[PDB]
């Protein structure tokens, strides 16, 4: 079996973020034109997806981390990762 990745990018340099689920933990590797380095994201999960968008010069990232039947959204809006409001179908 394999580690599971998800990727997003923005701008023209570009910035790239790659999320890897391995052994129940999701971590983040980052590129901004000057080498790869480890990002701040650390959350539990066996499955990962990601999307991002810009508002002006501000990036917003949403990572969807799942274990079992539970998906948790994690939000980056420039000031630390916080849990998002995402909930599944009812
Ligand atoms: C993320 C993920 C984990 C954590 C898994 C498994 C899978 C998995 O999904 P993914 O990697 O996308 O899909 C697989 C792929 C691409 C291949 C080629 C697989 C398997 C899976 C399924 C089946 C599988 C799984 C195993 C183990 C130990 C083996 C040997 C194993 O047979 P293997 O001959 O490699 O075949 O258990 P493990 O605790 O790693 O659980 C089950
Ligand atoms: C405490 C602290 C935080 C929270 C920072 C930064 C710095 C910082 O001070 P310090 O570490 O003492 O001094 C630095 C040192 C010694 C080096 C070698 C630096 C940077 C800093 C500056 C620049 C820097 C900063 C970055 C990021 C993502 C990178 C890649 C990044 O380039 P990097 O190749 O590491 O170069 O943002 P980050 O959110 O970490 O903010 C900025
Ligand atoms: O520059 C690296 C960083 O601050 O970029 C925004 C997010 O990807 C963070 O998790 C990450 O640590
Ligand atoms: O500011 C965080 C938030 O409102 O951003 C938009 C969506 O990702 C929401 O689930 C999330 O709670």
Numbering used by the authors: 1 to 90
Quote from the publication.
Here, we report protein recognition and assembly by a phosphate-containing macrocycle (pctx). We show that the C 3-symmetric phosphocavitand is a versatile receptor for N-terminal residues or arginine but not lysine. The macrocycle of interest is the recently reported phosphate derivative of C 3-symmetric cyclotrixylohydroquinoylene, dubbed pctx and produced in 3 reaction steps. , Compared with the bowl-shaped, C 4-symmetric sulfonato-calix­ ­arene (sclx 4 , a known protein receptor), the saucer-shaped pctx is smaller, shallower, less polar and less anionic. The test protein we studied is lectin (RSL, ∼30 kDa), a 6-bladed β-propeller with C 3 and pseudo C 6 symmetry.
Another phosphate of pctx forms hydrogen bonds with the Ser2 amide backbone and the Gln4 side chain. Considering solvation, eight water molecules form hydrogen bonds to the three phosphates (H2O···O–P-pctx = 2.6–3.1 Å). A ninth water is hydrogen bonded to the N-terminus (Ser1-Nα···H2O = 2.8 Å). Each N-terminus of RSL binds a macrocycle, the three of which form the base of a tetrahedron. A fourth capping macrocycle completes the pctx tetrahedral cluster and is devoid of a guest. The H3 cocrystal comprises protein layers interspersed by pctx clusters nestling in the approximately tetrahedral interstitial sites. The Lys34 side chains from three RSL molecules each form a salt bridge with a phosphate of the pctx cluster.
